[PDB]
Amino acid sequence: DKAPSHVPFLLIGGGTAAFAAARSIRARDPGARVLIVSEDPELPYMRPPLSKELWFSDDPNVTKTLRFKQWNGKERSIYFQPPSFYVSAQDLPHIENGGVAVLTGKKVVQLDVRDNMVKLNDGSQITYEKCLIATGSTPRSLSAIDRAGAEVKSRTTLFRKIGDFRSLEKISREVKSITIIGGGFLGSELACALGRKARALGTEVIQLFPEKGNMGKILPEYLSNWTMEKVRREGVKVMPNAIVQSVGVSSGKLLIKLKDGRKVETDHIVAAVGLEPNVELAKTGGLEIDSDFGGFRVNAELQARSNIWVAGDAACFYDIKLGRRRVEHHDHAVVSGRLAGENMTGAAKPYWHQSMFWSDLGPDVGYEAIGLVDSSLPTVGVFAKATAQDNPKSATYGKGVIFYLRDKVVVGIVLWNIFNRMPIARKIIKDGEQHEDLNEVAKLFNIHE
Ligand SMILES: Cc1cc2nc3c(=O)[nH]c(=O)nc-3n(C[C@H](O)[C@H](O)[C@H](O)COP(=O)(O)OP(=O)(O)OC[C@H]3O[C@@H](n4cnc5c(N)ncnc54)[C@H](O)[C@@H]3O)c2cc1C
């Protein structure tokens, strides 16, 4: 497949924000010709199932089919659309009423804003009328791993893509002990997925991290501690307050030394320690990056320059209500991709509809969030006992709401085992009231007493 020399809409990166923008552009302009350039070999696909539902499939071919059952048992593909949705890049200029093409296996390596042109890694050049940068993020590594040898590096997984799901799933069936470094939602999701697999055979899964509990940077202490206990009960050796000093090999085994003196022996490492946005194109492009939040600096309309927009993980945007931010979540990529697509077809609209976040630690435990969520912000938590419907599966102390406050106004919300109430949370954040009583506000989420 060969890119044309010119395309009206060029989308750089072939993930969630690009796919959503393509969909939005085609809705706004049913004859649009849209080219997605994607460095990966696969068509656009969603990432969340890679750490969740693909692990809970009992079909041993799931690795090949990439089809998963949602918690409620409905089956679907990780791909946003099948191959029949797309047209070829070479045919894109000619097909009547246009289409969406994906040039896979190609990376955009230079952006020339003045001449509305990009160059690919193979030396082809493509001129565009409107461009979206949707390049996503790259995993941080741990310095202790960077200092270790090549064997350690080759037995350390940075969990991002289909290839990683496949490689780690295989490892899971081969080794006796896997260690996850990182206490965030992704680390914790992998801990639960791996712990579930380990269970039949009682093999070992370790999760270690510097905080006092799982998701300690986002959740307050009570709930972070509650979450750690839940992960432990999934059959995981959880080691909080753990700072890695070094990692080496010995007797074929990986040896992890912690600052506090503890040592861990394991067969494979998964490092889930957060991300950096992929801003390589900003230097050739002369595009500003945000030194406070990372990412391309764009405005409330996701716009960087006259015919360049940025969406998804890579976009540091101005939120008129909540302030400048960069958000790295699936629904944000959907919302911002869609918005950029509308703005690329004349919309001129600001980011307004607040995107949400979720995480499931199996069919039985679910979190959703929206707005400014950071455990350093003042929080107020209101909780209750869970009913049988308060879990991710049935949706399609055991529950509660956490309010995140700034200038005594709710700027963020976390819902713990409370589903189908995101719109209420969104409306509370939108209205920016000073609430006399957050226990009264908790009643909007069916949390009483
Ligand atoms: C395992 C996993 C589980 C997750 N679970 C959740 C969840 O439960 N809930 C949630 O809210 N969020 C979740 N996320 C986060 C969510 O997937 C991301 O926020 C989302 O993928 C961001 O979309 P994006 O378009 O910005 O980037 P991506 O979807 O990452 O797409 C960027 C694509 O562009 C490619 N690319 C980069 N640079 C170039 C270039 N120069 N040329 C060509 N191609 C390029 C990249 O290789 C990549 O394929 C998860 C992420 C992972 C990895």
Side-chain angles (χ1 to χ4, degrees):
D1 289 357
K2 170 58 173 149
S5 61
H6 185 258
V7 73
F9 301 91
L10 172 74
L11 282 26
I12 304 175
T16 300
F19 176 84
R23 183 176 182 257
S24 175
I25 289 159
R26 294 280 293 162
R28 299 270 281 183
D29 170 5
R33 300 163 192 283
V34 180
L35 182 60
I36 298 174
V37 182
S38 177
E39 73 183 344
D40 293 332
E42 303 92 3
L43 293 171
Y45 68 92
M46 68 189 40
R47 315 287 198 256
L50 297 173
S51 65
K52 292 179 285 298
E53 297 89 349
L54 286 163
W55 291 93
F56 288 77
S57 182
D58 278 43
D59 178 343
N61 304 309
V62 64
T63 269
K64 298 169 188 202
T65 62
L66 302 174
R67 294 177 63 83
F68 60 95
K69 307 197 81 91
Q70 291 167 7
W71 305 129
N72 68 12
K74 213 219 86 167
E75 189 173 289
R76 65 154 299 164
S77 180
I78 49 110
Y79 290 104
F80 289 111
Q81 291 285 347
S84 63
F85 176 81
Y86 298 98
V87 301
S88 78
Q90 51 274 27
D91 289 337
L92 188 64
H94 309 118
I95 301 290
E96 161 176 316
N97 291 314
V100 185
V102 186
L103 225 217
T104 50
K106 301 284 173 188
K107 187 185 178 191
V108 174
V109 301
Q110 187 191 327
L111 174 59
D112 182 337
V113 175
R114 190 177 85 76
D115 301 327
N116 308 295
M117 188 187 257
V118 301
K119 303 194 201 182
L120 309 189
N121 61 299
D122 68 2
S124 353
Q125 306 198 147
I126 307 166
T127 58
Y128 57 81
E129 290 166 40
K130 307 276 178 72
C131 172
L132 175 69
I133 301 168
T135 50
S137 302
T138 278
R140 296 185 198 118
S141 186
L142 214 62
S143 60
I145 298 282
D146 297 340
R147 287 185 252 109
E151 203 197 334
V152 165
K153 278 184 259 278
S154 72
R155 297 171 66 190
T156 300
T157 295
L158 302 182
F159 195 91
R160 300 285 295 156
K161 297 179 171 176
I162 284 162
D164 307 309
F165 167 60
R166 289 176 163 157
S167 65
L168 191 55
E169 196 274 340
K170 184 161 196 295
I171 266 74
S172 192
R173 292 180 281 103
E174 290 170 342
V175 309
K176 302 273 194 139
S177 175
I178 300 168
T179 301
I180 294 145
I181 306 172
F185 284 93
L186 172 57
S188 303
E189 286 172 5
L190 292 169
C192 294
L194 287 176
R196 186 167 158 290
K197 295 287 191 205
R199 183 71 77 198
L201 173 62
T203 56
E204 178 180 58
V205 181
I206 304 168
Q207 182 185 18
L208 62 85
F209 46 78
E211 300 79 27
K212 288 164 69 124
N214 297 70
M215 291 92 87
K217 292 144 128 58
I218 280 98
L219 304 179
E221 299 206 347
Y222 167 74
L223 189 53
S224 173
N225 181 261
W226 182 96
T227 302
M228 183 156 63
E229 291 311 325
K230 192 274 185 319
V231 171
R232 285 176 166 151
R233 276 179 216 107
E234 296 302 321
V236 178
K237 166 169 177 169
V238 181
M239 306 181 66
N241 317 114
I243 302 165
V244 176
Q245 269 289 16
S246 58
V247 182
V249 187
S250 189
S251 95
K253 299 284 286 190
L254 304 176
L255 274 51
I256 301 165
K257 263 196 166 92
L258 304 172
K259 289 221 207 301
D260 63 35
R262 294 183 284 169
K263 333 184 91 167
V264 178
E265 306 185 349
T266 199
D267 305 316
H268 190 93
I269 292 177
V270 181
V273 298
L275 306 171
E276 297 300 347
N278 192 161
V279 294
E280 297 160 298
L281 291 170
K283 63 173 188 298
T284 55
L287 300 182
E288 190 180 13
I289 60 160
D290 191 281
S291 72
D292 302 294
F293 298 97
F296 297 89
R297 191 167 261 183
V298 301
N299 71 5
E301 306 167 22
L302 305 178
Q303 197 161 1
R305 291 286 291 279
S306 60
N307 61 352
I308 303 177
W309 290 257
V310 187
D313 288 359
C316 175
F317 64 98
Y318 186 62
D319 192 317
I320 293 158
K321 300 297 265 297
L322 299 181
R324 179 158 286 281
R325 288 164 86 185
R326 189 168 59 80
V327 181
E328 313 158 64
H329 297 141
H330 175 86
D331 186 60
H332 183 70
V334 173
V335 167
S336 63
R338 180 185 294 129
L339 181 60
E342 290 161 358
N343 289 351
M344 293 165 79
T345 50
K349 280 183 286 137
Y351 179 95
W352 203 248
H353 173 93
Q354 286 294 332
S355 65
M356 59 84 72
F357 166 80
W358 86 101
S359 170
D360 294 326
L361 305 179
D364 47 338
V365 178
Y367 310 81
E368 304 183 355
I370 186 168
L372 308 187
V373 165
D374 165 353
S375 69
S376 71
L377 290 174
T379 59
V380 177
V382 189
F383 308 94
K385 272 74 71 60
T387 69
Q389 67 145 0
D390 301 309
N391 66 71
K393 183 169 189 300
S394 306
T396 58
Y397 287 154
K399 73 180 176 166
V401 52
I402 302 171
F403 300 103
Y404 292 72
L405 306 164
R406 185 165 72 185
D407 307 317
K408 50 255 199 159
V409 163
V410 176
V411 290
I413 291 166
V414 164
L415 303 165
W416 170 40
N417 290 322
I418 296 175
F419 306 96
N420 301 311
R421 304 233 178 196
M422 193 48 66
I424 293 148
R426 186 174 290 111
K427 177 155 184 72
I428 291 159
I429 287 171
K430 188 191 173 177
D431 292 345
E433 266 192 87
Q434 293 185 31
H435 299 280
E436 279 278 292
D437 190 346
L438 292 172
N439 287 284
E440 285 303 303
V441 180
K443 291 182 181 155
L444 305 173
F445 298 100
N446 197 34
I447 297 304
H448 294 270
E449 295 177 23

